[PDB]
Amino acid sequence: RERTVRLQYGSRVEAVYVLGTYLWTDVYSAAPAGAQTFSLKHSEHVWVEVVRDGEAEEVATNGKQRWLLSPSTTLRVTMSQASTEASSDKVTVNYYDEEGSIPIDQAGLFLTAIEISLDVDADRDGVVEKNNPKKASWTWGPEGQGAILLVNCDRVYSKEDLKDMSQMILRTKGPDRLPAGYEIVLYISMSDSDKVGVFYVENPFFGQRYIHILGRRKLYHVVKYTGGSAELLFFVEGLCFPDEGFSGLVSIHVSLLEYMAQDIPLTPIFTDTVIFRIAPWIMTPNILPPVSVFVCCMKDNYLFLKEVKNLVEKTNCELKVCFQYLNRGDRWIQDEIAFGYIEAPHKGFPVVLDSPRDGNLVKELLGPDFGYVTREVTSLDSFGNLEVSPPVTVNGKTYPLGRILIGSSFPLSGGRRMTKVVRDFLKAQQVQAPVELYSDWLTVGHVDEFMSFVPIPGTKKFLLLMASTSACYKLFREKQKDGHGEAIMFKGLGGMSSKRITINKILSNESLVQENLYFQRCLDWNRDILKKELGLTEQDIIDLPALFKMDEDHRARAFFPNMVNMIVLDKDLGIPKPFGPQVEEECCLEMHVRGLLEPLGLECTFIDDISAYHKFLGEVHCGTNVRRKPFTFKWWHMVPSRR
Amino acid sequence: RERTVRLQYGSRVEAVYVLGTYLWTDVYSAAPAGAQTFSLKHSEHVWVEVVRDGEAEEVATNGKQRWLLSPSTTLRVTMSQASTEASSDKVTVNYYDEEGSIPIDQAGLFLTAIEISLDVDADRDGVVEKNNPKKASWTWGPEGQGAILLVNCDRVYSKEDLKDMSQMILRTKGPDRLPAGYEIVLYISMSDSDKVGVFYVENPFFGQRYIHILGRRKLYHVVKYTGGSAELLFFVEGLCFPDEGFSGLVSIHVSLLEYMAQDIPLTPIFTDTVIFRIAPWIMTPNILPPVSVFVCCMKDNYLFLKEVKNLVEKTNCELKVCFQYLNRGDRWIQDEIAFGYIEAPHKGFPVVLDSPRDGNLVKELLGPDFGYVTREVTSLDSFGNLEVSPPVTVNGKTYPLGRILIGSSFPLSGGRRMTKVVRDFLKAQQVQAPVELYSDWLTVGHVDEFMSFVPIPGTKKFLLLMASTSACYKLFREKQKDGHGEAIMFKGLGGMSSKRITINKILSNESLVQENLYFQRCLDWNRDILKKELGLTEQDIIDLPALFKMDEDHRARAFFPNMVNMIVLDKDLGIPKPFGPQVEEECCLEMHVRGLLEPLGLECTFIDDISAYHKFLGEVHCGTNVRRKPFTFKWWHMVPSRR
Ligand SMILES: [Ca+2]
Ligand SMILES: [Ca+2]
């Protein structure tokens, strides 16, 4: 970087010189009008070239050389090392008249050279490197660079409270003090002031207290210069995730400012900039290793608790049991809480999004391990309506973190849709490239009512599981042909007994057959979008028998529990107990599902969440959610499409 | 694209088949419960494979082959040609019981195959190609693809009124009619509804009238299907330029919708999408060939008009003379009007931005050749505060259209800044990558007060011209040393005479010397930013003598006319007449400027815009602006950095 400095008449101009720049210097303007030629001297650590019309020549510390005075003859002045107290760094120009050799005047430059660098971990290893040449930019991918910031998800300071934030270090080198008239100022834009905050210890002699120096209402902070080789440590937090109007990028600047006079702005002499990207929220698909299983239910649903405990005991997972709250639905751990994570090179942790039904009065429950983000509406707004696929490749395009799936209605339908605020949030994270499905044919309207994903044991592959009414009707027709038409469903649910629902009764209900043909069309429409957007073929899909009843809005609710919404712990699947028709004293739905899944090495455990209620009307009163290990793939290594 | 279709019990399912897809077909669900095996027949133009667990085999039109009935045994159905009236396209499945060979039932698919494609000129040649595989995406650069839209800048319809818009053609092929229950609908999102509009002729039998079918408040339009090979022509306009919240991309969709039943949404069977990018507004730098010169001034400034006419007569340019208006400043053609252009593959034209001082009451003046865009505040908001550089390369990064330059204040200064709305507009155009300079040290605050660009004749190169107070003081000191100190300025301006301003008087004014040293610091700060951001060296810069007086706010106004703001017509420069000190009956400022410029082949004509006012207080009462030919480089071939 070249900087312009002009000599002053009969004077020694004084300037700070910042390493990494050089000075092009006008000697002509300072010359007496009657002057003809000039000569120069300079100190050992100042390098001086005379540049005449683009051509440069190095000049000795004390030579006698003379040059003609011209506007087109200038100096180039360079220094490679910072000044100390022992330094006298200078360049002096002597001016001569017609009959020369005794100088008629002189003008000079007294220089104080300093190093100033605002440093961050741009190469993404967790350490703050010295002056990364790419630190002012942010690029995606394996070879990409620039620093990463985490949102503070827990919400005078202690250093321990700042332990998870990003480090930024102002590194300087110079003599005891800067010359009179200079200050160093750290600053941000008004726009970024609600995106970021910065902390440091303003007064280290009096203690370790970290104070917030940049953020809301504070756009700049003057930092004291200390001599020698010094480092000032700053901690930086993100205040919010990327969103519709915010890309995720923020900048922080330091400038060396020169005082000119009263009522005149200070001149930025040198400015150094770093950029951060705020890490996106990332959802964990069912193929990732489970860590903890969270369940909610009424205290007295004993079979559910006992059977979930037994399932989790087959695994290395921990079980966390939660009960119902006044401000939350009966499924809240599934519907109101979404499990995800954030990661930077220096740290990462799980982050839960919370959208309580009635608002807040759970952070206590989840524990200190989690970041916790709460929102400031239809049933499609539930996190039961959010899923994420395993990593996929679609027509050559890789989605290494998978793709988020959101239930919606058809564009021209006038139907329900997840709120724009949430849709825009998910889109803005960019790394999960969301896809909208069709859930609005369901009364509740959640994608988790019709689909899930499971890993295939012993492989890196996975299956899409789809609810299928066609599979159920085929199974029931087969059992009827076999002489089982009188087989009864809902055995043991006393509140269903008077209905006497059998295979015969279901198959002869004409309107119900027609409703379920239509629901199968809805399922198939989704099947096609999923195959297209996830790059799946029919060999990647298993159909589980399902059956629905229609409401007045022509929307579906489960006739018997939806088996597709299951607890996935690697090879072990907790599957809602269907209460299907009994054939030879086994549920034909359970037997059919085992016959589909078990050959693939999946182990099925049926979990009864409805017996405590004595009947099933389409509503489930329990919920589960799983904290999983993050992807091994670093999100910053992705190269998302541009917007 | 694979689509799921299931056969219906004892029936022939009827479906439309869209070319470019294929059907995976469930035959199992339609089978009688007591059925064991199936066979199939199909017509000549329907291709059928039996797929058993991923492995496919082609099946003849009439074979006798049988297969076991299984859920995992399906059909894949393909058609390569659209149906006609002569077609009977079908596939029929026969079902058999245990002791087989006479069918116990049959289910079938009657197919109507059609071609449906929404086509645009995505390969950017001006013609609408058939179904560009990339039409649903928009990519930058030489190899980039996707269609381009112009903003309608002039603001039942005639085709002639639509002549400049983009064409979009729905191409179909099929029989006389679609089966009952299907319609074709063109549509856009609510979000895009204020960005775009679409026109077509709804009733061609009754005339050519083009009606607006998509846009504000109209999100969809049902289009009538005609048989055979048909094309429907649509014209598409952009309603606005890219801005802070709008990337410039818009999408248009067509879907084939299937009627299900009353009070149920229609099912999109097939959807085709095209994307357009709205062309950005592009500013023309001084190096581009001049077409027309526009000037404004009071009717009686005769010397200005005479001398501008003489200048333009040396060129092939046309002169357009404008006078003053009640709602506009005296410089309005310079300050209130910015000349730029837009371009698409099929058309382009010049587009003026207008920001009248007092608002609108000029479009008449500019003529039908121009698009005209009017805005819906400090002096920094003027277009005199906007410039654009010639094409530059900066550290390997090419800016083939140049970079826009905007005057501002220092970040921490609390000074004036161009309004966010305009800054965000210029940034959003993306292709000119704007740079902020420091103009707020000037009373008026316009970059055109201190800098300009000129081409170097006979070359592809250019110069940056900078105002320099140091150059003026050096010249005046030289003339004083030569015995010319009593040389008077402002000769012929009677309202200046009593001041008796000479070289001596200027040089001995101590406070004025100090003010101008400070203004030179301001100029040099800009010099450094320009060298950095435009990739310039000192050999690319010429300094023109300038002098300023300071106001109460410590801001600069011209002491004598600023020569840097000049009319640039290739080699010919109209330069404001400075009225400098006369030495040997020539202005020493004019002679000095000629000595700088003329050796490079530039021809200087000094234009007197101030004599009609009898004095000069720092304000100029005339303005000029030039319509130039657009760049040869197509903006869509640029690859701008991502945001
Ligand atoms: Ca590092
Ligand atoms: Ca074309």
Side-chain angles (χ1 to χ4, degrees), chain A residues 2-51 53-98 100-154 156-159 162 164-208 210-216 218-223 225-261 263-298 300-363 365-375 377-473 475-643, chain B residues 2-51 53-98 100-154 156-159 162 164-208 210-216 218-223 225-261 263-298 300-363 365-375 377-473 475-643:
Chain A
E2 178 166 273
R3 171 186 161 204
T4 304
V5 174
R6 306 190 184 261
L7 300 190
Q8 285 162 228
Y9 178 70
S11 307
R12 318 291 217 94
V13 166
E14 299 181 50
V16 170
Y17 178 108
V18 180
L19 299 187
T21 72
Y22 62 94
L23 307 187
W24 87 268
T25 301
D26 166 8
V27 308
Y28 177 81
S29 298
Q36 289 313 296
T37 61
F38 71 97
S39 70
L40 73 94
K41 299 187 187 171
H42 65 83
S43 58
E44 81 179 305
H45 296 131
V46 179
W47 299 341
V48 180
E49 301 161 272
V50 165
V51 185
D53 193 45
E55 300 299 307
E57 65 182 302
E58 279 240 69
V59 179
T61 59
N62 186 23
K64 299 174 184 178
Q65 297 167 103
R66 270 184 308 212
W67 295 267
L68 293 171
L69 280 162
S70 169
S72 55
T73 295
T74 60
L75 304 188
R76 186 159 50 203
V77 178
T78 311
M79 298 176 72
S80 66
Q81 78 183 52
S83 299
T84 70
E85 288 300 301
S87 294
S88 309
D89 297 307
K90 57 182 157 46
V91 176
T92 305
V93 176
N94 284 316
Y95 299 107
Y96 304 83
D97 59 18
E98 259 289 13
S101 303
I102 307 293
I104 67 177
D105 202 355
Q106 83 170 24
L109 204 52
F110 279 124
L111 296 164
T112 298
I114 67 185
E115 183 186 337
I116 300 178
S117 190
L118 188 61
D119 292 344
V120 291
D121 166 25
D123 66 32
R124 303 169 182 167
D125 78 22
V127 177
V128 178
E129 70 272 22
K130 289 177 176 38
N131 193 26
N132 191 315
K134 301 188 180 315
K135 71 194 191 189
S137 302
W138 207 99
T139 50
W140 292 93
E143 314 304 321
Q145 298 204 60
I148 290 165
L149 194 48
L150 297 179
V151 178
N152 177 344
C153 289
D154 186 44
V156 167
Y157 302 86
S158 62
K159 177 154 183 175
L162 314 186
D164 303 331
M165 300 183 179
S166 295
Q167 296 190 345
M168 179 178 62
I169 301 170
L170 179 66
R171 298 189 162 114
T172 61
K173 187 170 185 164
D176 291 352
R177 45 183 62 258
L178 300 179
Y182 295 94
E183 64 172 5
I184 300 170
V185 182
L186 195 73
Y187 69 95
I188 55 170
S189 71
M190 177 66 76
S191 180
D192 287 344
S193 67
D194 68 350
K195 315 297 194 305
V196 72
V198 186
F199 303 78
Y200 93 137
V201 174
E202 164 91 26
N203 302 282
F205 280 151
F206 303 106
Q208 267 307 284
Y210 277 90
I211 65 176
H212 173 257
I213 58 151
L214 293 176
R216 314 171 182 278
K218 305 184 175 196
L219 306 191
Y220 70 86
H221 191 75
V222 174
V223 308
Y225 167 86
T226 66
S229 298
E231 297 196 348
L232 273 51
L233 180 58
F234 300 91
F235 285 97
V236 186
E237 63 177 0
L239 303 187
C240 66
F241 285 95
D243 71 24
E244 176 69 7
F246 172 51
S247 74
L249 298 169
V250 298
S251 299
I252 307 183
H253 314 277
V254 66
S255 287
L256 178 68
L257 300 183
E258 179 183 339
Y259 179 80
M260 306 303 291
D263 312 312
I264 288 176
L266 288 93
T267 305
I269 295 313
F270 170 83
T271 300
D272 203 20
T273 299
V274 296
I275 188 156
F276 285 98
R277 175 177 287 289
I278 288 180
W281 182 82
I282 305 171
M283 198 173 174
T284 51
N286 291 350
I287 57 101
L288 287 171
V291 177
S292 310
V293 177
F294 293 80
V295 305
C296 66
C297 62
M298 60 177 189
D300 75 333
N301 196 335
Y302 294 120
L303 277 179
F304 173 75
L305 288 161
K306 179 177 71 64
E307 293 173 353
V308 169
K309 289 184 184 180
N310 288 3
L311 170 68
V312 172
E313 281 171 6
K314 297 176 191 168
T315 73
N316 286 132
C317 303
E318 88 185 355
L319 178 63
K320 299 291 187 207
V321 176
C322 313
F323 303 115
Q324 311 290 12
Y325 292 95
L326 272 51
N327 63 320
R328 299 187 182 270
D330 292 333
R331 311 197 77 186
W332 69 269
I333 200 69
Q334 207 167 316
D335 290 345
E336 306 178 12
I337 301 296
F339 283 70
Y341 70 94
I342 64 180
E343 183 181 11
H346 57 281
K347 185 67 205 308
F349 40 85
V351 175
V352 145
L353 312 180
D354 181 20
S355 299
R357 188 189 56 193
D358 303 337
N360 305 82
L361 257 44
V362 176
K363 177 161 186 159
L365 181 277
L366 270 50
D369 282 28
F370 293 80
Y372 192 81
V373 171
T374 316
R375 65 143 127 90
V377 145
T378 72
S379 57
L380 273 70
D381 294 316
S382 161
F383 295 137
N385 195 31
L386 223 54
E387 286 191 25
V388 60
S389 80
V392 287
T393 295
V394 186
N395 298 314
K397 164 70 172 171
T398 302
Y399 296 94
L401 312 175
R403 305 190 69 180
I404 287 167
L405 305 162
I406 307 176
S408 193
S409 48
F410 296 142
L412 301 183
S413 68
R416 295 172 300 172
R417 197 175 185 188
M418 186 175 282
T419 66
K420 177 180 161 63
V421 171
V422 180
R423 292 190 282 103
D424 285 352
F425 168 82
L426 298 165
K427 171 172 78 161
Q429 305 316 292
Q430 289 187 80
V431 291
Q432 299 170 311
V435 172
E436 277 186 307
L437 303 179
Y438 174 40
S439 67
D440 200 33
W441 58 279
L442 289 144
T443 299
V444 177
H446 299 175
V447 290
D448 74 4
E449 292 177 275
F450 76 85
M451 58 168 293
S452 187
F453 296 98
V454 298
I456 295 175
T459 78
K460 70 279 108 202
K461 302 175 59 58
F462 70 88
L463 294 167
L464 165 65
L465 304 184
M466 291 285 295
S468 175
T469 70
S470 65
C472 195
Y473 276 91
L475 176 64
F476 286 3
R477 285 175 181 138
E478 181 181 322
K479 296 299 158 182
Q480 184 187 56
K481 178 258 306 171
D482 294 346
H484 302 108
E486 282 294 294
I488 76 147
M489 267 181 79
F490 306 118
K491 177 168 169 55
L493 301 172
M496 307 298 280
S497 299
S498 67
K499 300 168 189 291
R500 318 269 162 227
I501 300 170
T502 57
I503 284 178
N504 286 334
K505 189 175 274 69
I506 291 167
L507 294 177
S508 68
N509 182 335
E510 275 195 287
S511 63
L512 186 63
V513 174
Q514 294 306 302
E515 293 165 3
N516 281 275
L517 287 174
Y518 164 68
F519 297 141
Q520 187 65 52
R521 281 292 302 274
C522 299
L523 290 158
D524 291 341
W525 193 92
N526 281 287
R527 194 197 196 84
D528 295 343
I529 297 291
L530 290 158
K531 292 165 69 184
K532 178 191 183 179
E533 299 290 344
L534 310 178
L536 307 179
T537 67
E538 287 287 322
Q539 285 62 66
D540 300 314
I541 307 175
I542 291 190
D543 288 287
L544 306 179
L547 193 59
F548 307 90
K549 293 188 173 184
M550 183 177 277
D551 70 18
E552 308 73 53
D553 291 320
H554 311 286
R555 292 190 175 103
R557 70 191 175 274
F559 186 105
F560 62 76
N562 282 328
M563 287 188 280
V564 69
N565 183 207
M566 58 173 72
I567 308 174
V568 181
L569 311 173
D570 299 322
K571 74 179 166 58
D572 284 281
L573 308 179
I575 303 180
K577 177 177 182 184
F579 292 81
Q582 300 277 309
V583 179
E584 304 302 336
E585 302 176 1
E586 297 288 346
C587 171
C588 64
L589 290 166
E590 288 182 12
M591 297 297 99
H592 187 81
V593 169
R594 292 185 183 283
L596 290 166
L597 306 178
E598 298 186 341
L600 305 172
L602 294 157
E603 299 181 12
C604 299
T605 300
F606 295 92
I607 306 285
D608 174 351
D609 46 29
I610 69 174
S611 279
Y613 299 95
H614 305 289
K615 57 178 178 280
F616 181 75
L617 302 185
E619 192 178 356
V620 176
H621 304 286
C622 308
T624 77
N625 216 328
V626 182
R627 168 198 180 172
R628 302 182 182 277
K629 296 189 181 180
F631 290 103
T632 302
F633 187 93
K634 308 303 195 191
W635 64 266
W636 54 90
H637 290 163
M638 186 169 174
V639 186
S641 307
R642 47 193 292 162
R643 326 152 314 191
Chain B
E2 178 166 273
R3 171 186 161 204
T4 304
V5 174
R6 306 190 184 261
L7 300 190
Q8 285 162 228
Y9 178 70
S11 307
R12 318 291 217 94
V13 166
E14 299 181 50
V16 170
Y17 178 108
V18 180
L19 299 187
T21 72
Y22 62 94
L23 307 187
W24 87 268
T25 301
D26 166 8
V27 308
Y28 177 81
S29 298
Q36 289 313 296
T37 61
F38 71 97
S39 70
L40 73 94
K41 299 187 187 171
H42 65 83
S43 58
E44 81 179 305
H45 296 131
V46 179
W47 299 341
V48 180
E49 301 161 272
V50 165
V51 185
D53 193 45
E55 300 299 307
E57 65 182 302
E58 279 240 69
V59 179
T61 59
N62 186 23
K64 299 174 184 178
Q65 297 167 103
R66 270 184 308 212
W67 295 267
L68 293 171
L69 280 162
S70 169
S72 55
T73 295
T74 60
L75 304 188
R76 186 159 50 203
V77 178
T78 311
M79 298 176 72
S80 66
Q81 78 183 52
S83 299
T84 70
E85 288 301 301
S87 294
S88 309
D89 297 307
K90 57 182 157 46
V91 176
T92 305
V93 176
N94 284 316
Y95 299 107
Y96 304 83
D97 59 18
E98 259 289 13
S101 303
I102 307 293
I104 67 177
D105 202 355
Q106 83 170 24
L109 204 52
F110 279 124
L111 296 164
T112 298
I114 67 185
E115 183 186 337
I116 300 178
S117 190
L118 188 61
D119 292 344
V120 291
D121 166 25
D123 66 32
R124 303 169 182 167
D125 78 22
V127 177
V128 178
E129 70 272 22
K130 289 177 176 38
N131 193 26
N132 191 315
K134 301 188 180 315
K135 71 194 191 189
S137 302
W138 207 99
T139 50
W140 292 93
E143 314 304 321
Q145 298 204 60
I148 290 165
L149 194 48
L150 297 179
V151 178
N152 177 344
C153 289
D154 186 44
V156 167
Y157 302 86
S158 62
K159 177 154 183 175
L162 314 186
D164 303 331
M165 300 183 179
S166 295
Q167 296 190 345
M168 179 178 62
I169 301 170
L170 179 66
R171 298 189 162 114
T172 61
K173 187 170 185 164
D176 291 352
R177 45 183 62 258
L178 300 179
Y182 295 94
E183 64 172 5
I184 300 170
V185 182
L186 195 73
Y187 69 95
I188 55 170
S189 71
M190 177 66 76
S191 180
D192 287 344
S193 67
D194 68 350
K195 315 297 194 305
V196 72
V198 186
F199 303 78
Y200 93 137
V201 174
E202 164 91 26
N203 302 282
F205 280 151
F206 303 106
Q208 267 307 284
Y210 277 90
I211 65 176
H212 173 257
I213 58 151
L214 293 176
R216 314 171 182 278
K218 305 184 175 196
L219 306 191
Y220 70 86
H221 191 75
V222 174
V223 308
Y225 167 86
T226 66
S229 298
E231 297 196 348
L232 273 51
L233 180 58
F234 300 91
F235 285 97
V236 186
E237 63 177 0
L239 303 187
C240 66
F241 285 95
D243 71 24
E244 176 69 7
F246 172 51
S247 74
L249 298 169
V250 298
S251 299
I252 307 183
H253 314 277
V254 66
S255 287
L256 178 68
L257 300 183
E258 179 183 339
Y259 179 80
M260 306 303 291
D263 312 312
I264 288 176
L266 288 93
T267 305
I269 295 313
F270 170 83
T271 300
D272 203 20
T273 299
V274 296
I275 188 156
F276 285 98
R277 175 177 287 289
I278 288 180
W281 182 82
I282 305 171
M283 198 173 174
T284 51
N286 291 350
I287 57 101
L288 287 171
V291 177
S292 310
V293 177
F294 293 80
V295 305
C296 66
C297 62
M298 60 177 189
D300 75 333
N301 196 335
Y302 294 120
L303 277 179
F304 173 75
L305 288 161
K306 179 177 71 64
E307 293 173 353
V308 169
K309 289 184 184 180
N310 288 3
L311 170 68
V312 172
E313 281 171 6
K314 297 176 191 168
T315 73
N316 286 132
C317 303
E318 88 185 355
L319 178 63
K320 299 291 187 207
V321 176
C322 313
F323 303 115
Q324 311 290 12
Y325 292 95
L326 272 51
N327 63 320
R328 299 187 182 270
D330 292 333
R331 311 197 77 186
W332 69 269
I333 200 69
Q334 207 167 316
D335 290 345
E336 306 178 12
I337 301 296
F339 283 70
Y341 70 94
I342 64 180
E343 183 181 11
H346 57 281
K347 185 67 205 308
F349 40 85
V351 175
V352 145
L353 312 180
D354 181 20
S355 299
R357 188 189 56 193
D358 303 337
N360 305 82
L361 257 44
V362 176
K363 177 161 186 159
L365 181 277
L366 270 50
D369 282 28
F370 293 80
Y372 192 81
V373 171
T374 316
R375 65 143 127 90
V377 145
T378 72
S379 57
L380 273 70
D381 294 316
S382 161
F383 295 137
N385 195 31
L386 223 54
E387 286 191 25
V388 60
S389 80
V392 287
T393 295
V394 186
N395 298 314
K397 164 70 172 171
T398 302
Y399 296 94
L401 312 175
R403 305 190 69 180
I404 287 167
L405 305 162
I406 307 176
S408 193
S409 48
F410 296 142
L412 301 183
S413 68
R416 295 172 300 172
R417 197 175 185 188
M418 186 175 282
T419 66
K420 177 180 161 63
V421 171
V422 180
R423 292 190 282 103
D424 285 352
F425 168 82
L426 298 165
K427 171 172 78 161
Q429 305 316 292
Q430 289 187 80
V431 291
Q432 299 170 311
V435 172
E436 277 186 307
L437 303 179
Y438 174 40
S439 67
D440 200 33
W441 58 279
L442 289 144
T443 299
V444 177
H446 299 175
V447 290
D448 74 4
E449 292 177 275
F450 76 85
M451 58 168 293
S452 187
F453 296 98
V454 298
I456 295 175
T459 78
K460 70 279 108 202
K461 302 175 59 58
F462 70 88
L463 294 167
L464 165 65
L465 304 184
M466 291 285 295
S468 175
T469 70
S470 65
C472 195
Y473 276 91
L475 176 64
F476 286 3
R477 285 175 181 138
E478 181 181 322
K479 296 299 158 182
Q480 184 187 56
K481 178 258 306 171
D482 294 346
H484 302 108
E486 282 294 294
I488 76 147
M489 267 181 79
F490 306 118
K491 177 168 169 55
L493 301 172
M496 307 298 280
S497 299
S498 67
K499 300 168 189 291
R500 318 269 162 227
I501 300 170
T502 57
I503 284 178
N504 286 334
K505 189 175 274 69
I506 291 167
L507 294 177
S508 68
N509 182 335
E510 275 195 287
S511 63
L512 186 63
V513 174
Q514 294 306 302
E515 293 165 3
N516 281 275
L517 287 174
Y518 164 68
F519 297 141
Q520 187 65 52
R521 281 292 302 274
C522 299
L523 290 158
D524 291 341
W525 193 92
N526 281 287
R527 194 197 196 84
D528 295 343
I529 297 291
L530 290 158
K531 292 165 69 184
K532 178 191 183 179
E533 299 290 344
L534 310 178
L536 307 179
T537 67
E538 287 287 322
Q539 285 62 66
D540 300 314
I541 307 175
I542 291 190
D543 288 287
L544 306 179
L547 193 59
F548 307 90
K549 293 188 173 184
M550 183 177 277
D551 70 18
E552 308 73 53
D553 291 320
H554 311 286
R555 292 190 175 103
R557 70 191 175 274
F559 186 105
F560 62 76
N562 282 328
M563 287 188 280
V564 69
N565 183 207
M566 58 173 72
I567 308 174
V568 181
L569 311 173
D570 299 322
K571 74 179 166 58
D572 284 281
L573 308 179
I575 303 180
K577 177 177 182 184
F579 292 81
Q582 300 277 309
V583 179
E584 304 302 336
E585 302 176 1
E586 297 288 346
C587 171
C588 64
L589 290 166
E590 288 182 12
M591 297 297 99
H592 187 81
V593 169
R594 292 185 183 283
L596 290 166
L597 306 178
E598 298 186 341
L600 305 172
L602 294 157
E603 299 181 12
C604 299
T605 300
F606 295 92
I607 306 285
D608 174 351
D609 46 29
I610 69 174
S611 279
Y613 299 95
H614 305 289
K615 57 178 178 280
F616 181 75
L617 302 185
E619 192 178 356
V620 176
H621 304 286
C622 308
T624 77
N625 216 328
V626 182
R627 168 198 180 172
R628 302 182 182 277
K629 296 189 181 180
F631 290 103
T632 302
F633 187 93
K634 308 303 195 191
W635 64 266
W636 54 90
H637 290 163
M638 186 169 174
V639 186
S641 307
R642 47 193 292 162
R643 326 152 314 191

